[PDB]
């Protein structure tokens, strides 16, 4: 069949700033079982129908996986504005795919908190669609240049989520998977059942 379990059943998940892109090709993709599963809280699809996923075949399908807080799931859309939608992960305005999100408070939330999940807060420009920036350099907040040391006007470009079990809805970790259906430039490789 197609490898989809590893994306939706991995023990660990990538951070927003360093979101992982999994390339999928030469497989029989059964998107129906994903839609059937009630676990996925969000299954919004742009420019495609859930039933048409199996009916229509594509090639070079990509899967982007990352974890964001609950209230930021809205920012994952073709047209949106936010700190994570402009500096961490930006969808193209003509995006054609499904965004899948589900609560994972029982796995990612550590009792005391951890630095496993973190997001980028400072960036001079806006990311282009389907672009990732994993550079970790001291951000410069004024005329005076900054060295390796960080202090006033010298900010580390990453901040860590405070995922804890006590956090209420809207701050608990939510797994997010973005499926990008690339146009059939090449011969079809990822077709439905």
């Amino acid at each position, epitope marked *: 069949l197609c490898p989809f379990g590893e994306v939706f059943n991995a023990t660990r998940f990538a951070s927003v700033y360093a979101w992982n892109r999994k390339r999928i090709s030469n497989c029989v993709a059964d998107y129906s079982v994903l839609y059937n599963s009630a676990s996925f809280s969000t299954f919004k699809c742009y420019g495609v129908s859930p039933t048409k996923l199996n009916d229509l075949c594509f090639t070079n399908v990509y899967a982007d996986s990352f974890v964001i807080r609950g209230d930021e799931v809205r920012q994952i859309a073709p047209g949106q504005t936010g700190k994570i939608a402009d500096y961490n992960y930006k969808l193209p305005d003509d995006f054609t795919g499904c965004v899948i999100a589900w609560n994972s408070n029982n796995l990612d939330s550590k009792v005391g908190g951890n630095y496993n999940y973190l997001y980028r807060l400072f960036r001079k420009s806006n990311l282009k669609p389907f672009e990732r920036d994993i550079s970790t350099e001291i951000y*410069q*907040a004024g005329s005076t240049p900054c060295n390796g040391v960080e202090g006033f006007n010298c900010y580390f470009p990453l901040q860590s989520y405070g995922f804890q079990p006590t956090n209420g809805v809207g701050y608990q970790p939510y797994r997010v998977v973005v499926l990008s259906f690339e146009l059939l430039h090449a011969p079809a490789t990822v077709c439905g059942p």
Partner: antibody, heavy 114, light 104 residues
Framework: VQLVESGGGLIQPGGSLRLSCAAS????????MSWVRQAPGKGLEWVSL???????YYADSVKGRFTISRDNSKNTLFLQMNSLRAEDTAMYYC???????????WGQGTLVTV | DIVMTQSPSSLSASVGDRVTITCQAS??????CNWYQQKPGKAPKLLIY???NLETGVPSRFSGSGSGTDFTFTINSLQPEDIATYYC?????????FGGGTKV
């Protein structure tokens, strides 16, 4: 570090006024510049926020009538108030936000009367 | 919009007394509760961010605590310079909301 503000005064209702927020030791192209106003003898209220990339957010009351823009040539922040009502009479501050709405450093402030 | 109910207001106390400002929110603002200090006739300056962290330069007398919906601010020692107005800001929801303010 300093944020000098100017451009206040008296404006006829329905008129257009643009404020200025001069900056020093800061790059208005970054640092999440913002505007916060306070009515005379009242509490604070957020007005607008400018992202480093260019994204802007406006309060619903001042939506449409207020426009925020930056000038990287001279490191100045501008707030073009297209339409002014009686409620807009307040004291306007431009503040540097460490995050989206942290407002670590605040400007001197300008007074606008309509 | 989150309503940042703040009480007591116009609190007055003698020198050295500890003041505990309570600012409650209608919705969960998990840890996002800034505290600002506004001297008369001047722009407010931030004192506490994330309702626990103390801004650099601010004296150690000021202290904040609390998470979830209810938050507390304590000036501890009541320095004569502390006379000002204090506000609580959620700065998390898209329309950030300030509290009523306390005339300490």
């Amino acid at each position: 570090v300093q944020l000098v503000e100017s451009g206040g005064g008296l404006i006829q209702p329905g008129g257009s006024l643009r404020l200025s927020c001069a900056a020093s030791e800061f790059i208005v192209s970054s640092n999440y510049m913002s505007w916060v106003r306070q009515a005379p003898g009242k509490g604070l209220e957020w007005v607008s926020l400018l992202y480093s990339g260019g994204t802007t957010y406006y309060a619903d009351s001042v939506k449409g009538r207020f426009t925020i823009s930056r000038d990287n040539s001279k490191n100045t922040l501008f707030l073009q108030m297209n339409s002014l009502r009686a409620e807009d009479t307040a004291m306007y501050y431009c503040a540097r936000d460490r995050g989206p709405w942290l407002h670590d450093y605040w400007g001197q402030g300008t007074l606008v009367t309509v | 919009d989150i309503v940042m109910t703040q009480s007591p207001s116009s609190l007055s106390a003698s020198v050295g007394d500890r003041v505990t400002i309570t600012c409650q929110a209608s919705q969960d603002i998990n840890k996002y509760c800034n505290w600002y200090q506004q001297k008369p006739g001047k722009a407010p300056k931030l004192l506490i961010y994330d309702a626990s962290n103390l801004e650099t330069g601010v004296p150690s007398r000021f202290s904040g605590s609390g998470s979830g919906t209810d938050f507390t601010f304590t000036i501890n020692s009541l320095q004569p310079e502390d006379i000002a107005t204090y506000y609580c800001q959620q700065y998390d929801n898209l329309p950030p909301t300030f509290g009523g303010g306390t005339k300490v």
